Amino acid sequence: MKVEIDSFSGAKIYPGRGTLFVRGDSKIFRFQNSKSASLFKQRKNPRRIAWT
Amino acid sequence: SHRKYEAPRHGHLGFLPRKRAASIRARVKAFPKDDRSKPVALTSFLGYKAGMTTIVRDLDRPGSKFHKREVVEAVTVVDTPPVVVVGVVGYVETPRGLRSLTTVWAEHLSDEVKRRFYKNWYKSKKKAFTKYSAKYAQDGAGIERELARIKKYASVVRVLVHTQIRKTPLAQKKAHLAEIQLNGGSISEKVDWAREHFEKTVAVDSVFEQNEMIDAIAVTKGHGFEGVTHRWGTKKLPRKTHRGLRKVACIGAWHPAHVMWSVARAGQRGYHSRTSINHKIYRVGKGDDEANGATSFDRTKKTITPMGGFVHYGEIKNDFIMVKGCIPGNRKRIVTLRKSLYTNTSRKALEEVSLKWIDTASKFGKGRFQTPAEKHAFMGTLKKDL
Amino acid sequence: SGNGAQGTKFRISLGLPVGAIMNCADNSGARNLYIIAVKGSGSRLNRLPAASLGDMVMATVKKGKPELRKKVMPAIVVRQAKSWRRRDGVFLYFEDNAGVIANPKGEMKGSAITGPVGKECADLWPRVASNSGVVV
RNA sequence: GUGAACAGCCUCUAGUUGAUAGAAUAAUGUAGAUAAGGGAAGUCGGCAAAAUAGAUCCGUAACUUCGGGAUAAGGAUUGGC
RNA sequence: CUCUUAAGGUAGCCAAAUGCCUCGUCAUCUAAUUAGUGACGCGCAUGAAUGGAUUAACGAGAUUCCCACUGUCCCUAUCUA
RNA sequence: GCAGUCAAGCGUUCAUAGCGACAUUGCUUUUUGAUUCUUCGAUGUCGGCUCUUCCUAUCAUACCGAAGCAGAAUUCGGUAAGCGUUGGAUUGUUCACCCACUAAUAGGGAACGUGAGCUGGGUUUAGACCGUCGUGAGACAGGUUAGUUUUACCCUACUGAUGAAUGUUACCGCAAUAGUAAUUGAACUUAGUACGAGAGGAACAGUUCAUUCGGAUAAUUGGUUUUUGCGGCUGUCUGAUCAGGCAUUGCCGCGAAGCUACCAUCCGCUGGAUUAUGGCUGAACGCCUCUAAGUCAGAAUCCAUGCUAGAACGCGGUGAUUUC
């Protein structure tokens, strides 16, 4: 098991928790949870969001 | 007519009658086949489930693409505080079924169990096992003899056993109780093991062991009066159905001139009792041990207890168990474990699993931190800290 | 799947049934494929065939060159767009439903592929994994 | 008052507060709703529903009784200070 | 050539809301079509104010295909009153 | 429609591997007829949807035999209904055709199952068009178009629930009985082996996965939101602000808990008796023979194990059994 960071939010992602998203530019993103993922689908700014 | 498209039935008929249970607790309709070769030990145990959590390990299945690779799995906790023995009893054969002839009982009994016999305890004299007690206070007289009365007879022996519930978080204040069959040899010895074990506490660590397969026997959840769609997974009917669609249509033909037992119909869904076999153990629980939650590889003083606690259940201060999977029964329910009936090879009942990591994250949310410490380190100080 | 599967497959949430359309990640000359069947599929009353990554199907070309169009041909998924689970525990989903073309036995009739693909179809059908520059 | 507007929504004067009520919250229902991936494969049949929806600006087909088609299509924009 | 007509269906039109045999023959749209469209015509039994051929616009009219849309379906779930 | 018989012939040769003429015996009621017995003081009229059950004359799945069967694949046959038997275009369709997946894509009954269970597409009223016939109202298993689908609260049956009486009451518990369920395929090895001239090309064991079904759970993923929990936006009222009200839950973003999903996860047994069949010994019949006596092994079979209710008139064991 390896521990990661949220491609949106900046959190440790423990195994089989959260999700992953992929993008046809081969790029990978990780999400702890549906919140961050939904912001992502909303194509949002994790630098204007506060709690990141 | 020759039903046009010939498909599966819905349902299992061999779980009927789908009804509520006689009891919340699940009796053991059979026990393992004994060999008169062994030491004495039980064939079962009882415990209170508390929830699930998640487990990380490394697979050794030589041919799986995940061989020697990490995986995750889903397990549950079963609070196994040390069972008590209170009395045994004896059974013997007949032409017409095994049959009891004595129930011997200890001298001193916990108040937390004799409440089982009562329904309005708070206004009683408690007056129980008392004229029996005075059978003791003589050397063994009326008592040992029955044990001998059993040894004379009684192919099959069992043990009346109960819990020190009060340690559990719950406020049931009424222990449960049950039988267990014994599976050493030498019934004359079995009873003697027991006669020693009267009022003597027992822990499962003696009995079960890690990487062992078992069965589980318990009473599934309750949901209640349900419809023919869910209770049986029948179809939902289309949009333009008069008088509801969450139905079954043709419960039967003209002739036969009745309704068959084989038809999806409404009725209770849950509080049944079920038999869940072959769920491996991955770890034993030690109430008198911090780092129950640890592994070889993780190594923090973490227990199994999650941050903010289990849902509806709470702490795991007692001993405990970890078993692979999702077992029948819900939080706070008494669960009758049981050793298997037989010898499963399977190339999976034989794997010495080692644990890598155990998730303690809160389940009252979408948990991040295993722990306040970790949590504190990451976020840092707050307006609460000084 | 079938004749060409370089081994086998741990299940993944089927998310590309019939009537469906999925892009083409190769350079064969088609922009879409029309998923209509699956190999070795289930068999059930008014359930539809479902199809997943690594699976081999039959499809048809709507948009592209006429030598391709208006006929059936085998295809192979490489991207699902539906969140499946890997026994590492994780849930991952591409952003596209994407497949390619082949003969029955696993020869890409094209010459290369774009974008990501999944280790499943990769290790299950080799040639793909050759012409892939990317995998996850 | 918003708004184009006696549209809908809210409010003042004036009038009402009336339809058997209470605790519960299972099925089946009625009426409204929401749903991943897919997208009519259901289907007799896209019935229901969902989407589009205003205003400004641009762009605008074949056919045509040359009057229309035409909100054509199809695209953008819209806040607050 | 010939029988016959009071006259012998002209021009136009179609498997058409009229074409039994008919799921007519060909081509198309489809992966695939008794459908839909186009065309052919010995047309059981088309056809000229019994109105023929066509026709812009209009149509809660019928019929087909495509895009978008969506719990119609896969495949079923949940909440509400 | 289905099955047999005798064997002219075909099959290189060969009647009977597989086939079968000329004739012939029968069977089923799933076609359609035939009859008119019931029902015209009314049994809801085709088809589809859903749901269950049942049969066998078996497509597949098990086990075996036969082959003109080397292997391979195929074919004829046998016990077996246990288990399975699909997605779709067009047609109102039944039926049929086509496509495609398939291990396989078998036939059928149940008041031509099934309308107080749907639908109402066709048929089969009334309106309307056309064509042919008819002087005409009008007709046409000729076409087309639109056209109200009622009632259960009763009895039973099915499901689930409760329940008086057996000295009371409580706890543990046996099991008559009844039901039952798991099924199917692929990949790797074997094995490019066996076999075969070669082309080609296997099998059991064994491992990993999956299909269909079932039963449980809901850690995580996803879904759902009246937690009206949080925050956001409009419109309007509260003098302002603050905090808020209505907007048939105002709308939006999140959204814990709960529920839930092959959209998620886990699990799904081992022994016996046997069929077919092949066999041991061995008679009749001084030989032989799987059989008569006897006997062996052996199937997806049967019964058990196991799993599920617990007989409300089946039961044991056991604790305690009121005083003014």
Short mmCIF file of N, CA, C and O in Angstrom, two decimals, chain B residues 271-357:
data_model
loop_
_atom_site.label_atom_id
_atom_site.label_comp_id
_atom_site.label_asym_id
_atom_site.label_seq_id
_atom_site.Cartn_x
_atom_site.Cartn_y
_atom_site.Cartn_z
N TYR B 271 -34.94 -10.53 9.68
CA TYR B 271 -35.00 -11.21 10.95
C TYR B 271 -35.09 -12.72 10.77
O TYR B 271 -35.41 -13.46 11.68
N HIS B 272 -34.78 -13.18 9.58
CA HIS B 272 -34.54 -14.58 9.33
C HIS B 272 -33.26 -14.99 10.01
O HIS B 272 -32.53 -14.15 10.55
N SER B 273 -32.95 -16.27 9.93
CA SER B 273 -31.70 -16.79 10.43
C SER B 273 -30.99 -17.51 9.33
O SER B 273 -31.62 -18.25 8.57
N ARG B 274 -29.70 -17.32 9.25
CA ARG B 274 -28.96 -17.86 8.14
C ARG B 274 -27.64 -18.46 8.58
O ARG B 274 -27.16 -18.22 9.69
N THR B 275 -27.09 -19.26 7.68
CA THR B 275 -25.90 -20.06 7.90
C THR B 275 -24.87 -19.65 6.88
O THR B 275 -25.00 -19.96 5.70
N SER B 276 -23.84 -18.98 7.35
CA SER B 276 -22.83 -18.39 6.51
C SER B 276 -21.54 -19.14 6.73
O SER B 276 -20.99 -19.11 7.83
N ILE B 277 -21.08 -19.82 5.70
CA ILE B 277 -20.00 -20.75 5.82
C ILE B 277 -18.74 -20.16 5.23
O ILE B 277 -18.78 -19.25 4.41
N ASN B 278 -17.62 -20.71 5.66
CA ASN B 278 -16.34 -20.50 5.03
C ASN B 278 -16.03 -19.02 4.92
O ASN B 278 -15.91 -18.45 3.84
N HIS B 279 -15.95 -18.41 6.06
CA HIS B 279 -15.37 -17.09 6.20
C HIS B 279 -14.14 -17.18 7.07
O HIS B 279 -14.23 -17.43 8.27
N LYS B 280 -12.99 -16.97 6.45
CA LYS B 280 -11.72 -17.12 7.13
C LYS B 280 -11.51 -16.09 8.21
O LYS B 280 -11.98 -14.96 8.11
N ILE B 281 -10.74 -16.47 9.21
CA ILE B 281 -10.25 -15.56 10.22
C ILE B 281 -8.93 -14.98 9.74
O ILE B 281 -8.13 -15.67 9.13
N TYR B 282 -8.70 -13.72 10.08
CA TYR B 282 -7.47 -13.05 9.72
C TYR B 282 -6.73 -12.56 10.93
O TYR B 282 -5.56 -12.18 10.82
N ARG B 283 -7.38 -12.53 12.07
CA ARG B 283 -6.70 -12.08 13.27
C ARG B 283 -7.57 -12.37 14.47
O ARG B 283 -8.80 -12.47 14.34
N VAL B 284 -6.94 -12.50 15.62
CA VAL B 284 -7.61 -12.67 16.88
C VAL B 284 -7.48 -11.36 17.62
O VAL B 284 -6.55 -10.60 17.41
N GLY B 285 -8.41 -11.13 18.50
CA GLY B 285 -8.48 -9.90 19.24
C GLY B 285 -8.13 -10.05 20.67
O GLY B 285 -8.52 -11.01 21.32
N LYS B 286 -7.38 -9.08 21.16
CA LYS B 286 -6.90 -9.05 22.52
C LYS B 286 -7.33 -7.77 23.20
O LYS B 286 -6.70 -6.72 23.01
N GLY B 287 -8.37 -7.86 24.02
CA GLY B 287 -8.79 -6.71 24.77
C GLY B 287 -7.70 -6.13 25.63
O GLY B 287 -7.59 -4.91 25.76
N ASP B 288 -6.84 -6.98 26.18
CA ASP B 288 -5.75 -6.53 27.02
C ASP B 288 -4.51 -6.33 26.17
O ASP B 288 -3.42 -6.84 26.46
N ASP B 289 -4.70 -5.60 25.09
CA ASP B 289 -3.62 -5.33 24.16
C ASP B 289 -3.91 -4.13 23.29
O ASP B 289 -4.76 -4.19 22.40
N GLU B 290 -3.20 -3.05 23.52
CA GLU B 290 -3.07 -2.03 22.51
C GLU B 290 -2.29 -2.63 21.34
O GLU B 290 -1.58 -3.62 21.49
N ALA B 291 -2.45 -2.03 20.17
CA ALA B 291 -1.80 -2.48 18.94
C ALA B 291 -2.49 -3.69 18.35
O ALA B 291 -2.00 -4.31 17.40
N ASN B 292 -3.64 -4.04 18.91
CA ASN B 292 -4.56 -4.90 18.20
C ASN B 292 -4.76 -4.43 16.77
O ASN B 292 -4.94 -5.25 15.87
N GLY B 293 -4.72 -3.13 16.54
CA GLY B 293 -4.91 -2.60 15.22
C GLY B 293 -3.69 -2.59 14.35
O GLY B 293 -3.77 -2.19 13.19
N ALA B 294 -2.56 -3.03 14.88
CA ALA B 294 -1.31 -2.93 14.15
C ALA B 294 -1.07 -4.15 13.29
O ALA B 294 -1.88 -5.07 13.24
N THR B 295 0.06 -4.14 12.60
CA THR B 295 0.59 -5.29 11.91
C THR B 295 2.08 -5.38 12.12
O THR B 295 2.70 -4.58 12.82
N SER B 296 2.67 -6.38 11.46
CA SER B 296 4.08 -6.38 11.19
C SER B 296 4.55 -5.07 10.61
O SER B 296 5.56 -4.52 11.03
N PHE B 297 3.80 -4.57 9.65
CA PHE B 297 4.30 -3.57 8.73
C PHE B 297 3.90 -2.16 9.11
O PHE B 297 4.62 -1.21 8.79
N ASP B 298 2.76 -1.99 9.78
CA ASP B 298 2.27 -0.66 10.10
C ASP B 298 2.92 -0.12 11.35
O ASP B 298 3.65 0.88 11.31
N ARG B 299 2.67 -0.77 12.47
CA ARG B 299 3.38 -0.49 13.70
C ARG B 299 3.11 0.92 14.20
O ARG B 299 4.01 1.76 14.24
N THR B 300 1.86 1.18 14.56
CA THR B 300 1.50 2.25 15.47
C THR B 300 0.71 1.64 16.59
O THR B 300 0.07 0.59 16.41
N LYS B 301 0.68 2.29 17.74
CA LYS B 301 -0.17 1.82 18.81
C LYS B 301 -1.60 2.20 18.47
O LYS B 301 -2.20 3.06 19.11
N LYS B 302 -2.15 1.54 17.46
CA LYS B 302 -3.53 1.72 17.09
C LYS B 302 -4.28 0.44 17.37
O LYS B 302 -3.81 -0.66 17.07
N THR B 303 -5.45 0.61 17.95
CA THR B 303 -6.37 -0.48 18.11
C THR B 303 -7.20 -0.62 16.86
O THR B 303 -6.94 0.00 15.83
N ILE B 304 -8.23 -1.45 16.97
CA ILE B 304 -9.21 -1.61 15.92
C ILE B 304 -10.27 -0.54 15.98
O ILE B 304 -10.90 -0.24 14.96
N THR B 305 -10.49 0.03 17.14
CA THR B 305 -11.54 1.00 17.36
C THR B 305 -11.34 2.20 16.45
O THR B 305 -10.28 2.81 16.46
N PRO B 306 -12.31 2.55 15.66
CA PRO B 306 -12.14 3.73 14.82
C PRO B 306 -12.28 5.07 15.50
O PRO B 306 -12.87 5.21 16.57
N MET B 307 -11.73 6.07 14.83
CA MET B 307 -11.88 7.44 15.25
C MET B 307 -13.35 7.73 15.42
O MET B 307 -14.17 7.23 14.66
N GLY B 308 -13.69 8.44 16.47
CA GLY B 308 -15.08 8.69 16.77
C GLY B 308 -15.91 7.46 17.06
O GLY B 308 -17.09 7.60 17.40
N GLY B 309 -15.35 6.26 16.96
CA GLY B 309 -16.05 5.06 17.32
C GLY B 309 -16.87 4.43 16.23
O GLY B 309 -17.29 5.04 15.25
N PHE B 310 -17.11 3.14 16.43
CA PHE B 310 -18.01 2.39 15.59
C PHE B 310 -19.37 3.03 15.54
O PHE B 310 -19.74 3.81 16.41
N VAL B 311 -20.15 2.66 14.53
CA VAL B 311 -21.50 3.16 14.48
C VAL B 311 -22.37 2.28 15.35
O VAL B 311 -22.35 1.06 15.23
N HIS B 312 -23.11 2.90 16.23
CA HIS B 312 -24.13 2.26 17.03
C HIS B 312 -23.56 1.30 18.06
O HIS B 312 -24.30 0.86 18.94
N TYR B 313 -22.27 0.98 18.00
CA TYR B 313 -21.71 -0.08 18.83
C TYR B 313 -20.72 0.47 19.83
O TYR B 313 -20.89 0.30 21.03
N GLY B 314 -19.67 1.09 19.34
CA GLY B 314 -18.68 1.71 20.18
C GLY B 314 -17.36 1.00 20.21
O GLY B 314 -16.85 0.56 19.18
N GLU B 315 -16.80 0.91 21.39
CA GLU B 315 -15.45 0.46 21.59
C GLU B 315 -15.35 -1.05 21.50
O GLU B 315 -16.34 -1.77 21.47
N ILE B 316 -14.11 -1.51 21.45
CA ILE B 316 -13.75 -2.90 21.29
C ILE B 316 -12.82 -3.31 22.43
O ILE B 316 -11.89 -4.08 22.23
N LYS B 317 -13.04 -2.73 23.60
CA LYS B 317 -12.14 -2.96 24.71
C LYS B 317 -11.92 -4.42 25.02
O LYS B 317 -10.84 -4.79 25.47
N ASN B 318 -12.92 -5.25 24.81
CA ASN B 318 -12.73 -6.66 25.05
C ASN B 318 -11.82 -7.25 24.00
O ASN B 318 -11.30 -6.57 23.12
N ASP B 319 -11.65 -8.55 24.10
CA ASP B 319 -11.10 -9.30 23.00
C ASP B 319 -12.03 -9.22 21.81
O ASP B 319 -13.13 -8.69 21.88
N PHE B 320 -11.57 -9.77 20.70
CA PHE B 320 -12.35 -9.69 19.49
C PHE B 320 -11.80 -10.64 18.45
O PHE B 320 -10.94 -11.47 18.72
N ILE B 321 -12.34 -10.49 17.26
CA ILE B 321 -12.09 -11.36 16.14
C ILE B 321 -12.07 -10.49 14.91
O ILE B 321 -12.63 -9.40 14.91
N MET B 322 -11.42 -10.97 13.87
CA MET B 322 -11.59 -10.45 12.54
C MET B 322 -11.88 -11.63 11.65
O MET B 322 -11.17 -12.63 11.69
N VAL B 323 -12.90 -11.49 10.85
CA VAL B 323 -13.29 -12.52 9.91
C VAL B 323 -13.48 -11.90 8.55
O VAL B 323 -14.01 -10.79 8.42
N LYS B 324 -13.05 -12.62 7.53
CA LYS B 324 -13.19 -12.14 6.18
C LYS B 324 -14.64 -12.03 5.81
O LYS B 324 -15.37 -13.03 5.83
N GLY B 325 -15.04 -10.84 5.44
CA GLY B 325 -16.27 -10.68 4.72
C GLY B 325 -17.41 -10.06 5.46
O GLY B 325 -17.29 -9.41 6.50
N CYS B 326 -18.56 -10.30 4.87
CA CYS B 326 -19.79 -9.65 5.22
C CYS B 326 -20.73 -10.73 5.67
O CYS B 326 -21.21 -11.52 4.85
N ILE B 327 -20.94 -10.78 6.97
CA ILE B 327 -21.60 -11.90 7.60
C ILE B 327 -23.03 -11.53 7.88
O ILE B 327 -23.36 -10.35 8.03
N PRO B 328 -23.91 -12.51 7.98
CA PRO B 328 -25.29 -12.20 8.26
C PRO B 328 -25.46 -11.75 9.67
O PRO B 328 -24.99 -12.38 10.62
N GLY B 329 -26.11 -10.64 9.79
CA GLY B 329 -26.33 -9.99 11.05
C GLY B 329 -25.80 -8.59 11.04
O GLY B 329 -24.86 -8.25 10.32
N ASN B 330 -26.40 -7.78 11.86
CA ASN B 330 -26.14 -6.37 11.88
C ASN B 330 -25.48 -5.98 13.18
O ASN B 330 -25.24 -6.80 14.07
N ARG B 331 -25.17 -4.71 13.29
CA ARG B 331 -24.53 -4.19 14.47
C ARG B 331 -25.37 -4.46 15.70
O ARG B 331 -26.59 -4.35 15.71
N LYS B 332 -24.67 -4.88 16.75
CA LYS B 332 -25.16 -5.12 18.09
C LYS B 332 -25.80 -6.48 18.27
O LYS B 332 -26.32 -6.78 19.34
N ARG B 333 -25.77 -7.32 17.25
CA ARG B 333 -26.42 -8.61 17.29
C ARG B 333 -25.49 -9.71 17.73
O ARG B 333 -24.31 -9.73 17.38
N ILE B 334 -26.06 -10.67 18.45
CA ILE B 334 -25.32 -11.83 18.91
C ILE B 334 -25.13 -12.78 17.75
O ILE B 334 -26.07 -13.08 17.01
N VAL B 335 -23.92 -13.28 17.62
CA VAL B 335 -23.51 -14.03 16.46
C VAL B 335 -22.89 -15.32 16.94
O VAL B 335 -21.93 -15.30 17.72
N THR B 336 -23.42 -16.41 16.46
CA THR B 336 -22.94 -17.73 16.82
C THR B 336 -21.94 -18.15 15.77
O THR B 336 -22.31 -18.48 14.64
N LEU B 337 -20.69 -18.09 16.14
CA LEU B 337 -19.62 -18.65 15.35
C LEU B 337 -19.69 -20.15 15.40
O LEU B 337 -20.35 -20.74 16.24
N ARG B 338 -18.96 -20.77 14.49
CA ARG B 338 -18.88 -22.21 14.51
C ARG B 338 -17.77 -22.69 13.59
O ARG B 338 -17.71 -22.31 12.42
N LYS B 339 -16.94 -23.57 14.13
CA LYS B 339 -15.96 -24.27 13.32
C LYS B 339 -16.65 -25.02 12.19
O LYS B 339 -17.82 -25.34 12.24
N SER B 340 -15.88 -25.31 11.17
CA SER B 340 -16.47 -25.90 10.00
C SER B 340 -16.95 -27.31 10.29
O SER B 340 -16.74 -27.83 11.38
N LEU B 341 -17.60 -27.90 9.32
CA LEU B 341 -18.15 -29.23 9.46
C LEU B 341 -17.26 -30.28 8.87
O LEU B 341 -17.60 -31.47 8.90
N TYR B 342 -16.15 -29.88 8.30
CA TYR B 342 -15.43 -30.68 7.36
C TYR B 342 -14.16 -29.96 6.99
O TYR B 342 -13.83 -28.92 7.55
N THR B 343 -13.45 -30.53 6.04
CA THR B 343 -12.09 -30.12 5.74
C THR B 343 -12.02 -29.57 4.33
O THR B 343 -12.03 -30.34 3.36
N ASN B 344 -11.90 -28.26 4.22
CA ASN B 344 -11.91 -27.58 2.95
C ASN B 344 -10.49 -27.30 2.53
O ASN B 344 -9.75 -26.64 3.26
N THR B 345 -10.12 -27.80 1.37
CA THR B 345 -8.78 -27.57 0.86
C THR B 345 -8.73 -26.24 0.12
O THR B 345 -8.16 -25.26 0.60
N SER B 346 -9.34 -26.20 -1.05
CA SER B 346 -9.69 -24.96 -1.74
C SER B 346 -8.53 -24.09 -2.18
O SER B 346 -8.74 -23.09 -2.88
N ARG B 347 -7.31 -24.40 -1.75
CA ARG B 347 -6.18 -23.51 -1.96
C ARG B 347 -6.45 -22.11 -1.43
O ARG B 347 -5.82 -21.15 -1.86
N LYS B 348 -7.41 -21.98 -0.55
CA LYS B 348 -7.70 -20.72 0.10
C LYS B 348 -7.99 -20.87 1.56
O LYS B 348 -7.67 -19.97 2.33
N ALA B 349 -8.53 -22.00 1.98
CA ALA B 349 -8.68 -22.31 3.38
C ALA B 349 -7.36 -22.70 4.02
O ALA B 349 -7.34 -23.11 5.17
N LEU B 350 -6.29 -22.57 3.28
CA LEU B 350 -5.00 -23.07 3.66
C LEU B 350 -3.97 -21.97 3.65
O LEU B 350 -2.80 -22.24 3.92
N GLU B 351 -4.36 -20.76 3.32
CA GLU B 351 -3.40 -19.69 3.19
C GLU B 351 -3.13 -19.03 4.52
O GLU B 351 -4.05 -18.63 5.22
N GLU B 352 -1.87 -18.90 4.84
CA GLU B 352 -1.47 -18.19 6.03
C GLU B 352 -1.40 -16.74 5.65
O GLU B 352 -0.40 -16.27 5.10
N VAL B 353 -2.48 -16.05 5.91
CA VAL B 353 -2.60 -14.64 5.63
C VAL B 353 -1.78 -13.87 6.64
O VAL B 353 -1.78 -14.19 7.83
N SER B 354 -1.13 -12.83 6.16
CA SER B 354 -0.44 -11.88 7.00
C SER B 354 -1.05 -10.53 6.71
O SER B 354 -1.44 -10.25 5.57
N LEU B 355 -1.16 -9.72 7.74
CA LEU B 355 -1.79 -8.43 7.62
C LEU B 355 -0.75 -7.36 7.44
O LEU B 355 0.33 -7.40 8.03
N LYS B 356 -1.11 -6.39 6.63
CA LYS B 356 -0.26 -5.28 6.30
C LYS B 356 -0.77 -4.01 6.90
O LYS B 356 0.02 -3.15 7.31
N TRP B 357 -2.08 -3.87 6.97
CA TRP B 357 -2.66 -2.63 7.42
C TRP B 357 -4.15 -2.82 7.59
O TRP B 357 -4.78 -3.58 6.87
#
